[PDB]
């Protein structure tokens, strides 16, 4: 009966928690206590990218570490040449309420979506001189919160309804649907080998998915409120999540447990965007208090502060070569830091 | 300095900037509004009337054009979104106003409507965003009050001790009891409004029927008022 299934679920959860406690012998703080702190980190604003009419919700760096796509609520994607602050393209959108954007690894496509419930994919390199909508993907019943490219023909989208989906771009249809969340899915991060990906939802749980099979390998529940951002460690064996409980948490897939928490007594606003550095020694996390902090991912010590925005930081992206960190906010300015 | 191709790249960027300037005028001369309500509230009738008078299966947002005195207006409402609202409501903190249509002739879901209005009003991101509530379906309210079969006293105990405010202006001439009831509903919403406003945003009551043709004018007057007040705070007059 339903009571029997409920009791079975409770027993399974208890068994899982007992196993997780069994695998816990020394906290990462103890094993890291004997390394040199990174010391104070000062980063300066190198470029300010002006031109966006309204607040910016998303950004994505290019794999060439020079091009940059930015999305704003006024209904535009602007592709910036970060070195010279030139504008390469200005793509007008049908729906102005765009709140995700991605830049294809090959550099041929850019995707965007939002409250329109459609993941629109744009072709940058056409025989004509303009950028055209290659194809619009429909099928999500909620807002599209994040989308990421696996190759030029596959895209992974997270949506307002409790569902992620893997799309074929040539044939609009969904190849696989990922279900299991009990709340809105807000973020998404692909593994470096592009075989696994994690999604953070509004149920205070993060799940690691299997792209090929389509089943949830593990579920991570340590947070106290909804998760706003998520990103893989460059190893492929960890990820960090920022939630509305004003804390960032680092999980491990192999231990399947929460390692370390980055919290401060002063900080009460929630994290809105989380990104690692190349080595993973730094964990840059945006906040609602207009400032982005830098945490030592191994020691939970606040190393630096990136304070240059007159409104909340909505997006945050570290480039592939590690030379720069880009930050977008609701004041319609992007900033390249170094 | 910089080579010929870089000259041409900068010139293309300048062309893009000029196009962006043209967009800005239209973008800043057009006022955006968010339409909210329940399933029973006649907001579909309001949007149909506004679309007719002036100016794709799982789509999540619908957009409406209308123009009053050579001033443009956008009116969005959410179509496919789920019942949970705390995440996508943040995208609408720069709108001129929020239009909250509520069905005043239900008496049963009206407490849920009050709770929804309370959540909208006290939202951390929807501060400095005023609300234009349309206490819709007034003719059904009149019919149901004059019928007498269903009473408001049992849903809201405080109605027995309530009395009509002196500022009420029943224009056409109707039974005073329906006027008392409708002003009681308005005062409940206004109580939730004035509990914790702090003067950053206001609430504009209006009694409307879905057939009424003054809704566009009424939104225009309210939006004019909001912009004026905002301008006062912006030009350092208060």
């Amino acid at each position: 009966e339903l009571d029997q299934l409920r009791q079975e679920a409770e027993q399974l959860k208890n068994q899982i928690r007992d196993a997780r406690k069994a695998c816990a012998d020394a906290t990462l703080s103890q094993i890291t206590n004997n390394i040199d702190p990174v010391g104070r980190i000062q980063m300066r604003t190198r470029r300010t990218l002006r031109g966006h009419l309204a607040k910016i919700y998303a950004m994505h760096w290019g794999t060439d570490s020079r091009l940059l796509v930015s999305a704003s609520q006024d209904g535009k994607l602007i592709i910036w040449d970060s070195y010279t602050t030139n504008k390469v393209h200005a793509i007008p959108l049908r729906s102005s309420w765009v709140m995700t954007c991605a830049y294809a690894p090959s550099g041929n496509y850019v995707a965007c979506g939002g409250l329109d419930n459609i993941c629109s994919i744009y072709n940058l390199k056409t025989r004509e001189g303009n950028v055209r909508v290659s194809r619009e993907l429909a099928g999500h019943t909620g807002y599209l919160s994040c989308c990421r490219f696996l190759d030029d023909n596959q895209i992974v989208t997270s949506s307002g309804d409790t569902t992620c989906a893997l799309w074929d771009i040539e044939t609009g249809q969904q190849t696989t649907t990922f279900t299991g969340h009990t709340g809105d899915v807000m973020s998404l991060s692909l593994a470096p080998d592009t075989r696994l990906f994690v999604s953070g939802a509004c149920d205070a749980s993060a799940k690691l998915w299997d792209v090929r099979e389509g089943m949830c390998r593990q579920t991570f529940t340590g947070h106290e409120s909804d998760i706003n951002a998520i990103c893989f460690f460059p190893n492929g064996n960890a990820f960090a999540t920022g939630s509305d409980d004003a804390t960032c948490r680092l999980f491990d897939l192999r231990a399947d447990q929460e390692l370390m928490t980055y919290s401060h007594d002063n900080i009460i606003c929630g994290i809105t965007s989380v990104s690692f550095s190349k080595s993973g020694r730094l964990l840059l996390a945006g906040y609602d208090d207009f400032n982005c902090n830098v945490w030592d991912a191994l020691k939970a010590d606040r190393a630096g502060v990136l304070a240059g925005h007159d409104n909340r930081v909505s997006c945050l992206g570290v480039t592939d070569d590690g030379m720069a960190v880009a930050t977008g906010s609701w004041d319609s300015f992007l900033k390249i830091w170094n | 300095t910089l080579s010929a191709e870089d000259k041409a790249a900068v010139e293309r960027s300048k062309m893009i900037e000029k196009q962006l300037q043209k967009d800005k005028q239209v973008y800043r001369a057009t006022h955006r509004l968010l339409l909210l309500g329940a399933d029973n509230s006649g907001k579909s009738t309001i949007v149909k009337q506004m679309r007719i008078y002036h100016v794709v299966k799982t789509s999540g947002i619908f957009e409406t054009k209308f123009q009053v005195d050579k001033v443009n207006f956008h009116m969005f409402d959410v179509g496919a979104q789920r019942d949970e609202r705390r995440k996508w409501i943040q995208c609408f903190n720069d709108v001129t106003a929020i239009i909250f249509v509520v069905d005043s002739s239900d008496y049963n879901r009206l407490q849920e409507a009050l709770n929804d209005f309370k959540s909208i009003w006290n939202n951390r991101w929807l501060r400095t965003i005023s609300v234009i509530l349309f206490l819709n379906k007034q003719d059904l309210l009149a019919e149901k009050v004059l019928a007498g079969k269903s009473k408001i006293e049992d849903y809201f105990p405080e109605f027995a001790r309530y009395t009509t405010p002196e500022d009420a202006t029943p224009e056409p001439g109707e039974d005073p009891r329906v006027t008392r009831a409708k002003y009681f509903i308005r005062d409940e919403f206004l109580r939730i409004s004035t509990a914790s406003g702090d003067g950053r945003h206001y609430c504009y009551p209006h009694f409307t029927c879905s057939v009424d043709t003054e809704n566009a004018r009424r939104i225009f007057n309210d939006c004019r008022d909001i912009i004026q007040r905002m301008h006062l705070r912006q030009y350092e007059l208060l």
């Epitope: 020079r66 091009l67 550099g107 004509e128 001189g129 | 191709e5």
Partner: single-chain antibody, 229 residues
Amino acid sequence: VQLVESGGGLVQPGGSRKLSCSASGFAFSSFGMHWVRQAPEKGLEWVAYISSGSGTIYYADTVKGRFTISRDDPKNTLFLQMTSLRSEDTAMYYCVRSIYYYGSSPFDFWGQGTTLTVSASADIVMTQATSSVPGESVSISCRSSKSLLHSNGNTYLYWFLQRPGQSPQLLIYRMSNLASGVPDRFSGSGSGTAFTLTISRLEAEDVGVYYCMQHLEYPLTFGAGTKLE
């Protein structure tokens, strides 16, 4: 995309003629455009360039005052008004399409050309090797008077192939990037002054004249070009 231009014929010396280039199939207003000509038996030579939005107009030294260039975006045509035609203007005028942003491919498309006949300093000199050279591998070479490497990191060298009937089509841009549609056989290399173009497996359609280009500074000189047979 296509660029059809017309307006050529016999003209008495000292006369005037207007050449128009009708464009269709691409976003015309966003493409800067050039005019390139070649004498009945000589190499190509740059004439004029009009930018996107008509804000930057350059002319070659030999036509500095005689010609004027203009475009009509709504009508989607490109003009070249010529006045006082000398006898050294007999050529086939080509209509060239070029765009400029980071990563772009200038000079990607060329027009068919018009036949025009007239009755009886510190610029980069591009010098080609002897103008005569299946399954084999050829290594057409080139040289420049001034280093084509810039502080940006891009060396502006362009390779063009002209087959016997058609107008030239781009093969390599910025000496390393294969143009869209060119087979993987072609590849380019160089060091700043000397450059080479290599065809790994020559085929029947690879015969023609190979012209090079510099795009570091105006005017854009070409070079005589090498003939494969």
